[PDB]
Design a protein around this nucleic acid. Structure first.
Ligand SMILES: Cc1cc2nc3c(=O)[nH]c(=O)nc-3n(C[C@H](O)[C@H](O)[C@H](O)COP(=O)(O)OP(=O)(O)OC[C@H]3O[C@@H](n4cnc5c(N)ncnc54)[C@H](O)[C@@H]3O)c2cc1C
Length: 501
DNA sequence: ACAGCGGTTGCAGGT
DNA sequence: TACCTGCAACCGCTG
């Protein structure tokens, strides 16, 4: 009796998962030939390629738990195999007699190399491999192809291309498995019958002191529930313009579906379709680039360009990337990293980020601009690695692309527009409630200088119960000097990059 | 050929 | 209010 395997890596969902649905329609088509083994490989070869904070482990733990619950409703379960895909796949091809493997494709360099090996090792043992493209609405490979073998490097050019492509159908949830007993215990399940069960928090999070409030639980269920809440107000959705959403509202002012889209708990395609249904009922609506569909198209865009370039997360060797002489400065990196910059707005954001693992897009803008071209002149690659650790939604392509944007290394080139770490947040939080929350030491300062504590006299600071240099740090740089100064470094860097290009 | 246009989300100082 | 402006002038795309 041969086994059918779906491999979860992303696409952590039952709904709109063609790679998964094939296995289930295939098993039900000829029941009694097949066992079904939906697996997720807990890969230690991931921790040596990337950084993973506690908040995101909890998210993964919860997603895997929810994914297991849902598979059980389909008379199956999730099998969590510990091991590196190299050691794991040849063993399970053998002991399970794998007739077919399926998975959702990924453009990310680690997974491309991982996939090739498995694609090859599957052909070595005659296993059929059927991959699907469902993490994105459009296939980056086809987007590139229709643009004559090149990735379009502007948003509008990108839209023109994808409008010429038809959208795959959004699949529902797969068929409940019929007349299908549980698979026989392999060599590993015989030693330990719980070997492939869901990791507990204790097992997965080796670091529980670094967890913050569980504001965004993982899993398909919470993803679907949150989308429905996010789209309940159809007038809000129609008129949605990203630039008018607050970075410092205590409640998130956007959908916060990014972590769900990153793990594939929510299908980008389903989400796109729910929006398109709202568009019909609400013909007066925002367009790209600022609308919600437009935000999905940004995801698509960055995935396309990234797909074409394996050095996309890196300045050197990156076809898109401006070559800029960033400084090494450990003290300033360390201060930015732990929200100890002395600019309360920046510090507020980095602390929310660390504690909760999500921050608003424009909050990311503010801190990224500050780290790179705005103030500290530190490479975007560093900011990337921090975000990569702290973000629930860390996504290789998205993190890289947006970091290159904010440093004006690629895609964005108007480096004379520099965010003010003092001024930016005032429009949406003039009282500084956001700062009072994440920088509690300053929570008794008057609004007139909570963004600029260094304007308080010493006696003022004492009366506010927080002296600068002791209870909260002196600002590590003077924005009003360094941003003009950096603008001229950028002018200089661009001149050099032209004189090659 | 290269001036001119648009570019998801700047700031300060303006009506 | 939501769109003036000037800043010193960037990119890729277009015709
Ligand atoms: C320096 C920097 C790093 C970033 N790193 C990541 C990352 O690691 N992973 C990630 O998902 N987002 C990243 N973002 C992009 C963006 O900030 C988030 O996708 C967004 O804040 C998610 O919140 P939301 O779900 O409420 O987005 P919404 O405003 O509700 O938009 C809906 C969805 O569209 C997509 N989207 C929105 N904005 C962008 C964007 N600018 N680029 C690409 N896709 C977008 C997201 O999937 C998002 O969930 C980064 C932005 C910057 C400034």
């Amino acid at each position: 009796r041969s086994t059918l395997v779906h491999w979860f890596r992303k696409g952590l969902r039952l709904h709109d998962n063609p790679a998964l649905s094939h296995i289930f329609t295939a098993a039900n088509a000829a029941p009694g030939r097949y066992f079904v083994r939906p697996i997720f490989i807990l890969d230690p070869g991931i921790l040596d390629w990337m950084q993973v904070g506690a908040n995101r482990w909890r998210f993964l733990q919860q997603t895997l738990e929810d994914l297991d619950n849902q598979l059980r409703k389909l008379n199956s379960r999730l099998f969590v195999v510990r091991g590196k895909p190299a050691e794991v796949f040849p063993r399970i091809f053998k002991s399970w007699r794998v007739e077919m493997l399926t998975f959702e494709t990924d453009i990310e360099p680690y997974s491309v190399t991982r996939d090739a090996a498995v694609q090859k090792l599957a052909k070595a043992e005659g296993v059929r491999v059927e991959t699907h493209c469902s993490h994105t609405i459009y296939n980056p490979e086809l987007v590139i192809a229709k643009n004559l073998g090149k990735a379009p490097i502007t948003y509008q050019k990108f839209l023109g291309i994808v409008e010429q492509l038809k959208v795959p159908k959004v699949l529902g949830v797969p068929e409940k498995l019929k007349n299908m007993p549980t698979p026989p215990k392999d060599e590993v399940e015989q030693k330990d019958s719980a070997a492939y069960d869901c990791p507990t928090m204790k097992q997965l999070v080796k670091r529980p002191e670094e967890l913050g409030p569980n504001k965004f639980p993982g899993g398909e269920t919470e993803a679907l529930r949150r989308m429905e809440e996010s789209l309940k107000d159809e007038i809000w959705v129609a008129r949605f313009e990203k630039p008018n959403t607050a970075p410092n509202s205590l409640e998130p002012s956007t959908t916060v579906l990014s972590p769900y889209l990153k793990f594939g708990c929510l299908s980008a395609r389903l989400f796109n379709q729910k929006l398109k249904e709202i568009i019909k009922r609400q013909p007066k609506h925002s367009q790209p680039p600022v609308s919600l569909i437009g935000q999905l198209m940004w995801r698509e865009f960055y995935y396309t360009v990234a797909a074409a370039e394996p050095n996309f997360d890196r300045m050197l060797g990156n076809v898109y990337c401006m070559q800029i002489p960033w400084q090494e400065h450990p003290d300033h990196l360390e201060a930015w990293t732990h929200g100890r910059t002395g600019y309360p707005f920046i510090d507020a954001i980095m602390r929310q980020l660390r504690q909760e693992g999500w921050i608003h897009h424009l909050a990311r803008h503010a801190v990224a601009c500050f780290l790179t071209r705005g103030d500290l002149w530190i490479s975007w690659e560093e900011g990337q690695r921090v975000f990569e650790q702290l973000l629930l939604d860390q996504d290789w392509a998205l993190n890289a692309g947006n970091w290159m944007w904010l440093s004006a290394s690629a895609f964005f080139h108007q480096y004379f527009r520099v965010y003010s770490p003092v001024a930016f947040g005032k429009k949406t939080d003039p009282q500084g409630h956001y700062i009072r929350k994440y920088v509690p030491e300053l929570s008794k300062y008057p609004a007139g200088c909570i963004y600029e504590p260094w304007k308080a006299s010493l006696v003022d600071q004492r009366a506010y119960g927080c002296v600068l240099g002791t209870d909260y740090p002196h600002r590590i740089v003077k924005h009003e000097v360094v941003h003009k100064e950096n603008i001229k470094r950028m002018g200089a860097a661009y001149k050099v990059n032209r004189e090659v290009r």
